[PDB]
Amino acid sequence: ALPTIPYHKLADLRYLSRGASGTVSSARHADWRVQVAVKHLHLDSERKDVLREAEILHKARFSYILPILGICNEPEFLGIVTEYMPNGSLNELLHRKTEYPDVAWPLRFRILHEIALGVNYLHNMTPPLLHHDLKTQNILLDNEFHVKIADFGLSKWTIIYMPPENYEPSIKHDIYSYAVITWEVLSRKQPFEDVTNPLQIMYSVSQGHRPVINEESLPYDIPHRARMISLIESGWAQNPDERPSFLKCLIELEPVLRTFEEITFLEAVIQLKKTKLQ
Amino acid sequence: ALPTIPYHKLADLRYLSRGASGTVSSARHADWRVQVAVKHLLDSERKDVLREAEILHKARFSYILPILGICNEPEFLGIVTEYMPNGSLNELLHRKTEYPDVAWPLRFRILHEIALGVNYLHNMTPPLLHHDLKTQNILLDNEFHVKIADFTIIYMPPENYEASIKHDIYSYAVITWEVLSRKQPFEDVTNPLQIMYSVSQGHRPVINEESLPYDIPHRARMISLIESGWAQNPDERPSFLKCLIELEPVLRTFEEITFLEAVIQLKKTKL
Numbered sequence: 001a002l003p004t005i006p007y008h009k010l011a012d013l014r015y016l017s018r019g020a021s022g023t024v025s026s027a028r029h030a031d032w033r034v035q036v037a038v039k040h041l042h043l044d045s046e047r048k049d050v051l052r053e054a055e056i057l058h059k060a061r062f063s064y065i066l067p068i069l070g071i072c073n074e075p076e077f078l079g080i081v082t083e084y085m086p087n088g089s090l091n092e093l094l095h096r097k098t099e100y101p102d103v104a105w106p107l108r109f110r111i112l113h114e115i116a117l118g119v120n121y122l123h124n125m126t127p128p129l130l131h132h133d134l135k136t137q138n139i140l141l142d143n144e145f146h147v148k149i150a151d152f153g154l155s156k157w158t159i160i161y162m163p164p165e166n167y168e169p170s171i172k173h174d175i176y177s178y179a180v181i182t183w184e185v186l187s188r189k190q191p192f193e194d195v196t197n198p199l200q201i202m203y204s205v206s207q208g209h210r211p212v213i214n215e216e217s218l219p220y221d222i223p224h225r226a227r228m229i230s231l232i233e234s235g236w237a238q239n240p241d242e243r244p245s246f247l248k249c250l251i252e253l254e255p256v257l258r259t260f261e262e263i264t265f266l267e268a269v270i271q272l273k274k275t276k277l278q
Numbered sequence: 279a280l281p282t283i284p285y286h287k288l289a290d291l292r293y294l295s296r297g298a299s300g301t302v303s304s305a306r307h308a309d310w311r312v313q314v315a316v317k318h319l320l321d322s323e324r325k326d327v328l329r330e331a332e333i334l335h336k337a338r339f340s341y342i343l344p345i346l347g348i349c350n351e352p353e354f355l356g357i358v359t360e361y362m363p364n365g366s367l368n369e370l371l372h373r374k375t376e377y378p379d380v381a382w383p384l385r386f387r388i389l390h391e392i393a394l395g396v397n398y399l400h401n402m403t404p405p406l407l408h409h410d411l412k413t414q415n416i417l418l419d420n421e422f423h424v425k426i427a428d429f430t431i432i433y434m435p436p437e438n439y440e441a442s443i444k445h446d447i448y449s450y451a452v453i454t455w456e457v458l459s460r461k462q463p464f465e466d467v468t469n470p471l472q473i474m475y476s477v478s479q480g481h482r483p484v485i486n487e488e489s490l491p492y493d494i495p496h497r498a499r500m501i502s503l504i505e506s507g508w509a510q511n512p513d514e515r516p517s518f519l520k521c522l523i524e525l526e527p528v529l530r531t532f533e534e535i536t537f538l539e540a541v542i543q544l545k546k547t548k549l
């Protein structure tokens with residue numbers, strides 16, 4: 001069902017990312033005259049398995065999920081083709097502080113809202129996705145800084161977003177990841193920044209330690225600061241059963257987003273783009 | 279396999295439009311907690327309506343309205359799509375109290391995106407068999423980016439009431455004229471038969487100092503494109519590829535920030 005795209009239609013390949021599951025490059029489609037992204041997934045048994053995996057992802061169609069435009073089924077080369085997200089990843093927005101000295105709260109909360117809507121959609125699919133690897137690197141930002149999430153199985157097929165019960169390989173995985181991401185969005189800090197050995201992070205986390213919550217990490221002027229802190233701490237609870245559903249997150253978040261007028265979101269985006277021009 | 283959506287999942291229906299093809303309402307999806315739009319359209323007809331909609335499911339592109347699912351009820355068929363908060367191109371062009379200004383950069387962006395969207399549909403394998411492009415089914419998202427839902431007779435080429443592959447460019451030429459003029463094509467003519475007859479004899483919306491002011495950017499190129507697009511002879515009409523070639527230079531003359539300023543100024547004035 002998912003359209004096949006001849007590799008010969010793609011030109012001007014440029015590196016975007018290099019992960020374990022595959023390389024991602026931007027490319028220009030000859031016929032469509034737009035940019036796309038292609039993930040180069042690093043035998044007939046493998047080809048059959050890779051098509052089935054990608055056709056599962058084809059079911060996901062929602063405004064906050066990265067659209068898959070087709071598959072490159074080449075002889076030596078398998079590739080997933082998606083929309084190109086001009087503004088890159090949430091990780092880049094949060095941590096590139098020369099480029100983005102300020103990120104206005106309304107935009108940050110819009111991002112959080114859209115992430116949760118996207119994951120909520122994935123959780124309501126029948127069946128749900130079996131694999132989960134939500135992180136700031138696979139939350140992408142379109143031309144108007146709206147979210148499209150690309151947390152497909154592909155990552156499984158960094159440990160800071162992974163809940164401790166997953167260290168020894170539940171419907172409570174994504175909310176844990178989201179709580180860390182929320183913390184990261186509100187702080188613009190690296191989770192566990194002091195700790196440099198990932199194994200030390202894993203040990204600490206397994207014993208109930210989490211990214212730091214205080215007046216320094218999470219500024220006083222966070223809207224609904226105390227409710228957000230409460231949401232974060234519930235989301236990354238040691239006990240998976242204590243963690244809220246994404247439904248419950250959305251219920252908590254919708255009030256917060258009502259405090260911003262629609263025009264302030266656009267002003268936040270335009271101020272991002274203006275400052276970035278220097 | 280286009281997803282089925284139980285009708286009971288949609289709530290708080292509000293009227294958006296009433297056409298011959300069906301009623302369209304906004305609704306809230308209970309599980310997804312977002313706004314959607316639903317078009318309220320025998321087993322032979324139900325199967326044919328599903329087949330038609332599953333063909334549209336293949337089309338995935340930024341400038342094409344996504345179909346999210348089908349309401350497959352016994353007595354009720356319904357297509358569900360994303361909700362487009364800013365409605366149709368027709369509303370933007372013609373509601374001049376609401377929208378006294380629509381800055382040129384925004385108008386050209388709309389034209390560019392329409393052409394990219396139709397170009398996409400024309401490159402599908404196979405291409406779409408049915409064609410009904412009009413300002414009413416060109417929709418505008420929250421930041422006034424286009425999504426076309428082309429899955430009135432002023433957009434119809436003369437050979438329709440006397441070619442298959444030259445229909446959309448004819449409609450696009452009229453739409454282009456309408457975007458640049460903000461006038462109703464054939465506004466003076468009140469009998470639809472007179473429009474059809476006039477068009478069949480080679481008459482078109484008027485091109486002069488009144489319809490298309492001298493201050494339109496790239497006025498000469500745009501007029502050239504319009505007149506080629508609605509040529510009497512279907513063979514003389516350009517491909518959408520050729521439109522895109524002509525348009526890309528024009529769109530390069532605007533900085534990306536001017537588009538956003540145009541949208542914000544639209545929303546401010548609208549208050």
Ligand SMILES: CCN(CC)CCOc1cc2ncnc(Nc3cc(OC)c(Cl)cc3Cl)c2cc1OC
Pocket residue numbers: 015016017024037038039080081082083084085086087088089092137138139140150152154
């Ligand atoms: C260099 C330009 N930079 C500057 C800041 C901006 C543009 O950067 C990105 C655009 C992307 N567009 C779409 N997809 C991406 N990734 C991806 C693709 C997938 O399939 C194909 C899957 Cl399955 C998953 C992902 Cl995450 C993107 C990643 C990007 O930068 C990391």
Ligand SMILES: CCN(CC)CCOc1cc2ncnc(Nc3cc(OC)c(Cl)cc3Cl)c2cc1OC
Pocket residue numbers: 294295302314315316317357358359360361362363364365366369414415416417427
């Ligand atoms: C001025 C009114 N305001 C606020 C109330 C702007 C909102 O207006 C609209 C939003 C729409 N959102 C999505 N789809 C539409 N239409 C449509 C849907 C289809 O299936 C579901 C098909 Cl198959 C085709 C179409 Cl055209 C829409 C049409 C609209 O008109 C007014």
